[PDB]
Chain length 115, copies 4
């Protein structure tokens, strides 16, 4: 699988477990089409979202449902969700990890792209 998502919780110092994640691919008419989705595991990771054959070049959006995550923990959040928008580009063999570190009023995201 060429696309994985990993989510951490900066308040509790833990993987962010059971977070809903939706991936969209930008269509020709500029709308966002559902592409893959799931919930993070007990390790905060979401594997198996797509396959090499399905994951073609294009613009993708990863939407992480942070508001529901914080609400399930009883913590007051700022954002509706965290959004990560990027172009997939075929520069030799590549695997993409979209990582996010969550706080109630802040988040960070990094792309780890490896061969």
């Amino acid at each position: 699988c060429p696309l994985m998502v990993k989510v951490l919780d900066a308040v509790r110092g833990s993987p962010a477990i059971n977070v809903a994640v939706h991936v969209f691919r930008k269509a020709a008419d500029d709308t966002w089409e559902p592409f893959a989705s799931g919930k993070t595991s007990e390790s905060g990771e979401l594997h198996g979202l797509t396959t090499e054959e399905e994951f073609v070049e294009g613009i993708y959006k990863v939407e992480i449902d942070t508001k529901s995550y914080w609400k399930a923990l009883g913590i007051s959040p700022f954002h509706e969700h965290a959004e990560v928008v990027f172009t997939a580009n075929d520069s030799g063999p590549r695997r993409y990890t979209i990582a996010a570190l969550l706080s109630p009023y802040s988040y960070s995201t990094t792309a780890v792209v490896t061969n």
Copy 2:
């Protein structure tokens, strides 16, 4: 009531001339254009909106990070940063949306004051 500040984590400097587009969710659930501007030499974008215009709603602040890096000769990973939040639900607040940029990573924080 809405200010945006952007920093560059490679240079340790304000991120100057970053385009920012703000949208507000309309009644038909689409993103309507709300305001736009660019960061100044200090990395700050003031004057996007007014107290009258900045009503309750769900807002999206799109920070055009790819255009920023490309103008510096760098090919970055992300298209833009997208900060989405419900504003003013318990009355007017002042929002500072801050972003810290690297070519393959960014962080964003909200400072909300009364």
Copy 3:
């Protein structure tokens, strides 16, 4: 020439009353006390030093994050944040050391201007 700004990522607010201790590496390779202060209501700490006092050197800015969280009733992970850098090596610069705090995580950024 040296300012420290601290934000709280749980509240989306300035981190107020954060103690900050600055040290400078002495000729015997030990950390000598250089300056200290606390962040104001804006989360900013001004007036730590002067242009005359802030000579070249290796400086350590210790931000007392554990004391901050404990005063808010929270048990955090880190003892403090420690920002270590060589200053003024190519002439005087102005340094802003920023920190963004959560109970189990923090980030720190330097904004350096001439």
Copy 4:
């Protein structure tokens, strides 16, 4: 092993490989005593630093040699190193991951503490 270190590079979007990491434990006289050290692997991870028997409660410092990392990549850095200082506390079974995300003028660090 109860203590692992993971380092990512925010400029290149990659694990931070071959980064020197030194762990110290605070001694009774308030000095920092060497405790463990190593270099991150091709995955940006440093495993096997210590054992359950050696890793007692106390105050620890993890020093990540970021300046040498950036210099090996030809990139101008701000910090001498990144320093992570924390108390280890025996609250049931615990494993500690100290994660760091590096940029030339900024770094972030998070603690992932799991059972």
